[PDB]
Structure formats: C-alpha cells, structure tokens
Amino acid sequence: KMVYSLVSVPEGNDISSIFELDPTTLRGGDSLVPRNS
Amino acid sequence: ESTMKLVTNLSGQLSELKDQMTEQRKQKQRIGLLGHPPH
C-alpha cells in the first residue's frame, strides 16, 4: 500500500517538493555533506 | 600546563554539548516553525 509516489511538478514554491538527507552512518547536524556519500 | 590539557578539555566538552543541544533547539526554532504556519 504505497499511498505516495514521486512525480515531477513545474511549480517550485510549494513545500511538497522539500526533502531531507539522512546519512547511513550517524553524523552531526552541522557538518558539510560530502559530495559522494 | 600540559596537565591543563585535561583541565580545559573537560570544560570544553561540558560547554560544547550544551552548546550543540542549544544549537539543535535553535535549528528547531527554524525547521519546526517553518511547517507550523498554515496555507
């Protein structure tokens, strides 16, 4: 039961197109994201 | 004064975990209050 699926939207100002990055290994919240992690 | 290493590191860490939890609360001040106002 997948209620939500990823699509493309032309509008940009909506909050529905906002994502967050969760590292696989625990890292501090004030660290620079490596390019290839 | 090389013994001051352990003397000052305890102070540094005791200050910094409090600073980072306060900074996490500050990060909440933005991220939580961003999604609170309605549309």
Complete DSSP assignment for A22-37: --SS---TTSPPPTT-
Q: Which chain B residue has its CA at the smallest distance from A16's CA? A: B35
> From which experimental method does this structure derive?
cryo-EM
Contact by Cβ (8 Å): A33, A21: yes
Dihedral, CA atoms, A14, A16, A21, A22, nearest 10 degrees?
A: 150
* DSSP run (H or E) holding B30: helix B4-34
Tell me which chain A residues have a C-beta less than 8 angstroms from the C-beta of B35.
Answer: 15
A8: exposed, middle or buried (C-beta count within 10 Å: 0-12, 13-18, 19+)?
exposed
Kindly determine whether residue B27 and residue A15, on different chains, have CB atoms separated by under 8 Å: no
Single-letter code of the amino acid located at A17: S
In angstroms, this model's resolution equals: 3.5
Q: Which chain B residue has its CA at the smallest distance from A20's CA? A: B31
Q: Could you tell me the two tokens for B3? A: 């013994």
